[PDB]
Ligand code: HEC
């Protein structure tokens with residue numbers, strides 16, 4: 284899917300995690316976030332269209348998703364050990380990373 | 390140093406990074422910040438003084454500094470590599486993580 288679709292998937296599953304009742308629910312939402320981040324990592328954002336595909340700004344954009352995926356993996360590790368509160372807390376650590384990419388590339 | 394002093398160091402050295410013009414200064418301030426964060430991690434904050442150190446909240450508090458330290462290291466790598474503007478921008482994005490912890494425990 285394209286970038287706005289994947290961002291909607293990111294945003295909607297954050298709320299699913301916030302309201303989750305067990306760690307397996309958090310797990311399911313996080314795996315869907317993980318796939319959406321990796322799919323978005325293949326897009327070219329508008330504010331970098333007129334830029335070389337190999338530009339350092341393109342690689343910083345792509346590495347922003349690598350960082351986010353690492354944090355999603357960190358939260359998945361807690362969710363798969365049944366720690367619903369702790370994986371929920373880890374998922375809200377994502378929000379600042381969301382905003383840091385937006386500040387430069389949205 | 391006590392918790393409040395370490396916060397003073399983090400707050401004042403963020404502004405030092407803002408006004409610096411060369412990597413040597415950025416490195417110096419990021420280094421003071423990194424030690425202050427690791428020192429603050431060992432404290433018990435007043436809004437948690439009647440919890441136990443193994444309480445979730447006390448572990449969430451600790452984990453916030455682990456995460457902040459890693460992002461300081463990322464900015465130190467940029468200033469060791471001599472990219473002053475990028476390191477200054479990485480340091481500005483620390484504020485979101487400051488605020489996230491503050492909204493819970495400040
Ligand atoms: C870069 C590394 C990003 C990260 C990490 C996240 N997002 Fe993002 N987001 C990014 C761009 C470039 C854009 C604009 C894309 C465009 O073509 O307009 C966005 C946009 C959003 C939006 C608005 C959706 C829309 O239809 O325009 C939302 C709601 C959004 N992003 C949410 C979001 C969340 C919750 C993130 C982390 C969990 C996140 N984004 C990360 C780039 C990047």
Ligand code: HEC
Nearest residue numbers: 392393396399400434450453454457483486487490494495
């Ligand atoms: C938790 C993981 C925190 C992180 C990360 C940061 N801060 Fe912090 N801050 C925290 C607490 C619990 C408190 C209250 C301490 C107390 O004893 O009252 C604070 C306080 C501050 C203050 C005000 C200090 C004072 O005047 O008493 C400042 C200016 C401040 N913090 C700055 C700051 C900055 C710039 C941070 C990121 C670089 C940062 N803090 C991170 C908890 C946490």
Ligand code: NI
Nearest residue numbers: 350354380456
């Ligand atoms: Ni991070």
